[PDB]
């Protein structure tokens, strides 16, 4: 069991950046793969990124790579996720999610445990 909280939301200006992350309560969060996922109302919702247990592996949605970098902090239990050269296509409901199978946390069915979701709403 694990539970998540996203904070770091908010309103940006296209071009800029924004920082999330996302809190678990536990020290056992380590073990899961974490990863990023986002929802447009009325659409579908969509992967973002995701990273390993210990920090090795990460994927990104191929509409944000090379914009966007996740990471962790397995001390403080934080993932992050760093937004850059934000898009007006960037809005919507940004969801952290785990995963004890790191394969399976991009796959919409993937994983276990889901955040309520913090909202970005980029500008232009």
């Known amino acids: 069991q694990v539970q998540l909280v996203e904070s770091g939301g908010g309103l940006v200006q296209a071009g800029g950046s924004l920082r999330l992350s996302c809190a678990a309560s536990?020290?056992?969060?380590?073990?899961?793969?974490m990863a990023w996922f986002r929802q447009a109302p009325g659409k579908e919702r969509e992967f973002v990124a995701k990273?390993?247990?210990?920090?090795?592996?990460?994927t990104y949605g191929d509409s944000v790579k090379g914009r966007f970098t996740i990471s962790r902090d397995n001390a403080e239990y934080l993932v992050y996720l760093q937004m850059d050269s934000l898009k007006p296509e960037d809005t919507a409901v940004y969801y952290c999610?785990?995963?004890?199978?790191?394969?399976?946390?991009?796959?919409?069915?993937?994983?276990?445990?889901w955040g309520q979701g913090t909202q970005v709403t980029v500008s232009s």
């Open positions: 999610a785990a995963d004890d199978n790191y394969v399976t946390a991009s796959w919409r069915s993937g994983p276990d445990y």
């Open positions: 536990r020290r056992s969060s380590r073990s899961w793969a």
């Open positions: 990273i390993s247990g210990d920090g090795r592996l990460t």
